[PDB]
Design an enzyme around this catalytic site. Structure first.
Site, short mmCIF file in Angstrom:
data_model
loop_
_atom_site.label_atom_id
_atom_site.label_comp_id
_atom_site.label_asym_id
_atom_site.label_seq_id
_atom_site.Cartn_x
_atom_site.Cartn_y
_atom_site.Cartn_z
N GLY A 122 2.46 6.33 10.17
CA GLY A 122 3.82 6.02 9.81
C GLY A 122 4.49 4.79 10.40
O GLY A 122 5.63 4.57 10.18
N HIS A 140 0.79 -1.21 0.00
CA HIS A 140 0.00 0.00 0.00
C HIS A 140 0.83 1.27 0.00
O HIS A 140 0.33 2.33 -0.03
CB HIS A 140 -1.17 0.01 0.99
CG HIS A 140 -0.80 0.16 2.42
ND1 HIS A 140 -0.39 1.35 2.96
CD2 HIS A 140 -0.86 -0.71 3.45
CE1 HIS A 140 -0.18 1.20 4.25
NE2 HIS A 140 -0.46 -0.04 4.57
N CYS A 165 3.50 1.73 9.63
CA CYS A 165 3.31 0.61 8.72
C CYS A 165 4.65 0.07 8.23
O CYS A 165 5.55 0.81 8.05
CB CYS A 165 2.42 0.98 7.54
SG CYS A 165 0.73 1.26 7.88
#
Lengths: 301, 300
Positions: free
Chosen positions: A143, A41, A145
């Protein structure tokens, strides 16, 4: 003595974390050998996330749509491909710090350490146990991820988790390092409902052994129970069914403390039926389920 | 979202750990620059620990009395001395991994990460607070002495704890990195015991502030309190008295949330008197006291 939720030392991991930017999106990646792993993503805008078609989104990118930064040094992406829900970026530099590693798919109830990371930079470390429903209760901020979860055996890091999503109810969903999601979840920003989280029973039992190994024995009793009678009770309290395999696993802790597994189950049945009455176990007022039997043995010796 | 107790990443610390042996006693040491720091009790046998004169025991030793091992490379001690309750061993090699660092003496209620080590090799990392009674509720096993406690800010590691002793209740005691014990404790195996402990009021309040920051306001109320009235209640519940200094420390959180500190105190007092009603705050059924105001700001 004492019992704490303890993480693995994070240094081997810390040296694998990098930053990955595609357009306006920055998230973490894992740099092992000459490959960087990150959530696919990364290629999506916030609008994209509502209904992404990843194959479409991906062909519209080239090796240079991706900027990978390790510390200062910026790594040149020389390939890219998608494996399930991960992006794999070949880079032109091999990571000098790569540890002995493997990729593992964890079973629910198992535990691991998470290195929370922002912009490729390590921020904190904590231990969490995959829920039965395949979510984890983490601390992830925007942030985080691409932050990873791992176990360490000897010198070998077994990576088991990569963070992808926050669920509407505030719980977290992610993939193994082959990019297959734990649980039913998908990398779309839409409501997705968690299952019903059953309490881990094996872990709670292990914890009770830890408590005993640490001299907290108030909860013990003269009774025994059959496995069947235990389950008939536990299952009223949203506890996972206990199986002979689970009973077998507890055997070493049983041997170390001299309390038979079914006897411990009898204690638990009472704790479940009668509460703790203002007492605590190993300092908790609640029955703890995030320690595996291995965790207890690792810690308690 | 989410709130978890989080340790600092440990790698900068892991690089400094070594194993120190004197006679049959092996424990951990911290290697920074050309010096290794370790508990002075490395020099005492079991029977010594009952009644040791450290100065007497130490003169009896030489540099080669001490074996320092970094991984598989043996270090060579070329000097030694005693600083309070620590041994400082000068070694002939400087640690190439020495991080920027400092030595800090922590205050009661403050938090730090612990890297538990055995035989010089790091086993696990956890977060813990210095209790009001000056002990830590650690997880330590035999051979853990010399394991360290630290905070990291930017690239600088501030060391604040070195492990020395286990007390009868299973709690732990130790020193700062100058070798001075936190608390009244000594490195002698005596009948010494932890004092009565109290809940760290400042931390619980910071944690309530974290909860609102994270979107939860259920425990809030229409009331206010004077500090004294608060202390009057909280003390019955075994809470540390709240100081004006503590109220100031909470100022930034109070501003971030729009909840005056004394208004939060009113919330806490009701929680104490009434309980939580089967409810939870930040996932906990109890009032959590091991998050400082700094920790909250860090995480949130």
């Amino acid at each position: 003595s004492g019992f704490r939720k303890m993480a693995f030392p994070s240094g081997k991991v810390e040296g694998c974390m990098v930053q990955v930017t595609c357009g306006t999106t920055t998230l973490n990646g894992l740099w092992l050998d000459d490959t960087v792993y990150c959530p696919r993503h990364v290629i999506c805008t916030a609008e994209d996330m509502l209904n992404p078609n990843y194959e479409d989104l991906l062909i519209r990118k080239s090796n240079h749509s991706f900027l990978v930064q390790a510390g200062n040094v910026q790594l040149r992406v020389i390939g890219h491909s998608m494996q399930n829900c991960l992006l794999r970026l070949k880079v032109d530099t091999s990571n000098p710090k790569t540890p002995k590693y493997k990729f593992v798919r964890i079973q629910p109830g198992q535990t691991f350490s998470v290195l929370a990371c922002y912009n490729g930079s390590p921020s904190g470390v904590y231990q969490c146990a995959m829920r039965p429903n395949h979510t984890i209760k983490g601390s992830f901020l925007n942030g985080s991820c691409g932050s990873v979860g791992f176990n360490i055996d000897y010198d070998c890091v077994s990576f088991c988790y990569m963070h992808h999503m926050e669920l509407p109810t505030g719980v977290h969903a992610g993939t193994d390092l082959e990019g297959k999601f734990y649980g039913p979840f998908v990398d779309i920003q839409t409501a997705q409902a968690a299952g019903t989280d059953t309490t881990i029973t094996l872990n709670v039992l292990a914890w009770l052994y830890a408590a005993v190994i640490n001299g907290d024995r108030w909860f013990l009793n003269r009774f025994t129970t059959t496995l069947n009678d235990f389950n008939l009770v536990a299952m009223k309290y949203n506890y996972e069914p206990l199986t002979q395999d689970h009973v077998d696993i507890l055997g070493p802790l049983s041997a170390q403390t001299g309390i038979a597994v079914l006897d411990m189950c009898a204690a638990l049945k009472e704790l479940l039926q009668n509460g703790m009455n203002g007492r605590t176990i190993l300092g908790s007022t609640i029955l703890e389920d995030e320690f595996t039997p291995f965790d207890v043995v690792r810690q308690c010796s």
